[PDB]
Amino acid sequence: MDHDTEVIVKDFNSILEELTFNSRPIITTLTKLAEENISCAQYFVDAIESRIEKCMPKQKLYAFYALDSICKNVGSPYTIYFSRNLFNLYKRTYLLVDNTTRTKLINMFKLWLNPNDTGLPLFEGSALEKIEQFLIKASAAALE
């Protein structure tokens, strides 16, 4: 991680640390940084997942909204990287947050099935199937 890379990554991390509520300007700014610095894609992904793992219940959702915005507006390679840990990330988060936050996690998932009316799933079909099965077992989605 050279100089320029370390500067950019450190800045992304500082901005992410201010995401304590549903901030549109911060989410859009992180989205623009992701689109303009694809070379640092992997560090941005690690930063977002670590944030989700370490912060309080409420704040876990907004970090997930940053992930959602980047994946819907920028697309690859972010959609591919996040697909790798999406199930474990979503499940562990769901099991550690309140029920109102859970309905918002559920609606976010629904739009992942048909984003921007494209008719094509946002993430790997497998991750999404596992999440749906988890939701059914948690009485959060209708059985078939």
UniProtKB/Swiss-Prot annotation:
What GO biological process terms are annotated to this protein in UniProt?
Answer: mRNA 3'-end processing; termination of RNA polymerase II transcription; termination of RNA polymerase II transcription, exosome-dependent; termination of RNA polymerase II transcription, poly(A)-coupled
Portion of the full-length sequence here: 1 to 139 of 626
Question: Cellular location of this protein?
Answer: Nucleus
User: Does the record's keyword annotation contain RNA-binding?
Assistant: yes
The consequence of residue 66 to D is: Loss of interaction with RBP1 CTD
Could you tell me what this protein is called? Protein PCF11
Q: What is annotated about its quaternary structure and interactions? A: Component of the CFIA complex, which is composed of RNA14, RNA15, PCF11 and CLP1. Interacts with RNA14, RNA15 and RTT103. Interacts directly with the phosphorylated CTD domain of RPB1/RNA polymerase II.
Name all CID domain ranges: 4-139
* Gene Ontology CC entries for this record: cytoplasm; cytosol; mRNA cleavage factor complex; nucleus
Superkingdom of this protein's organism: Eukaryota
Q: What does this protein do?
A: Component of the cleavage factor IA (CFIA) complex, which is involved in the endonucleolytic cleavage during polyadenylation-dependent pre-mRNA 3'-end formation and cooperates with cleavage factor NAB4/CFIB and the cleavage and polyadenylation factor (CPF) complex. Independently involved in RNA polymerase II transcript termination. Binds RNA. Seems to bridge RNA polymerase II and the native transcript and may be involved in dismantling the RNA polymerase II elongation complex.
Give the GO molecular function terms.
Answer: mRNA binding; RNA polymerase II complex binding
Instruction: Give the gene name.
Output: PCF11
Record keywords: mRNA processing, Nucleus, RNA-binding, Transcription, Transcription regulation, Transcription termination
Q: Region Interaction with RBP1 CTD (CID): start and end of each range?
A: 1-130
Quote additional remarks.
Present with 2800 molecules/cell in log phase SD medium.
Species this chain originates from: Saccharomyces cerevisiae (strain ATCC 204508 / S288c)
- Chief site of localization: nucleus
